[PDB]
Amino acid sequence: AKKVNSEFLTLTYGALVTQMLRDFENAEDVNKQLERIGYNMGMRLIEDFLARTSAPRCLEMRETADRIQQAFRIYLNIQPTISNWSPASDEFSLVFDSNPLTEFVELPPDLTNLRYSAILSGCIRGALEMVQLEVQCWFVQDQLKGDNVTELRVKFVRRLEEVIPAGED
Template sequence: MAAKQYKAIGEEAWKNNVEKVNAELFIFTYGSLVVQLVKDFEDYGAVNKQLDKMGYNIGVRLIDDILARTGIDKCADFHTTAEVVAKVGFRVFLNIAPAIANWSADAKEFSLILEDNPLNDFCELPPKAVQEGLWYSNVLCGVIRGALEMMQMQTEVWFVHDVLRGDDVSEIRVKLVKILDEEVPVGDE
C-alpha cells in the first residue's frame, strides 16, 4: 500500500471508527499521572522507565484495536511499518500524523517528527525536570515499542528532541533490533 493509502485509512478510522474522548480531560489526566509518578519515584529516570512500561502495556493492547478498525495486514517491511505507525496509529488515537525522517543507511532506524504533540498541551516542565532528563511524553515510546513487539518486531524507541525541553520539534527515534519468531503459546498448538 502506498503512503497516501495509509493516510486515508488513518483519517477514515479517526472520522468513523473511534469513540472520542475530551482532549483536555485526557491531557490533564495524563499530566496528573506524570506529576504523581514524579512524587512517587522522586527520580526522573525512574519516571521515564515507568512511563515507557505503561506505554508498552497500552501498545500491546492497542495494536489489536488498530488492526480491527482498519483491516490492515501485517507490514511487509520496516518502511511500511513506519508509514502505518505515523499515518494510522497516531491518527487513530491522537489525531496527528508525524512526519517520517532520518532513515538510517541500513533502513533499520527512522525518526517520527511531531510538529504537534497533544500530550504537551498546557504543560511546561520545570528547569530541574529538563536538567535531570524527564521525557514527559515517554509513554508514546512505550506504546510504539509494545505495538511493534506484537507485530513480531523487537525495537528500541526513545525521544531525541522535545519541544518541552526547548527544541523546535519533538522527535522519537525507532530502531529495529530484530524480527521475532512467531511463537505459539504453550497449550495452543
C-alpha cells in the first residue's frame, strides 16, 4: 500500500541534499557521498524486492532489466520503460518520467555540476552488488538538467553470481 505520501519522501530527500550542500562545500563530494548511501540502500532494496518476489536470477540482461523496472514501479509506484539496448544486448537505458525524489525540486544554477538524483544510481549499484552482479549505472539524462525524463545507463560489465547458489565469495 506504501502507506505514505509522495511529498514526504520528497521532503526527506530535499533535506538530505540541502544538508549535504551545507556540511560539505563541493558538489562532487556530496554527490559521491550520496552515491555511497545509495549503494548501501541497494544492499537492502534488492533483498526486499526479492522478498516481495523471488525473481529468476539471470538468463539474460533484459530479464534483470524488467525485474528492476518492476521494482522501480513497486516502491516508487511509477512504471519505468526500458529502452536503448546495446547491439550486444548487454546494456540498456531506464526511463523515469518523474521521480518523487527528483520532482518537487528544481536546482539553483550554481549546482550544475551536481548530479542530483544519483541516489538511484547508487541504489542500483549496491542492489546489484549484494546480488553479486557487476554493473555500471549512471544517469545519461536527468529530468533536472533539461532532459525530457531521467535516463540512466546500465552497463553489466561481468558476472559474480554463478548458476549454482554456492557462488564465489
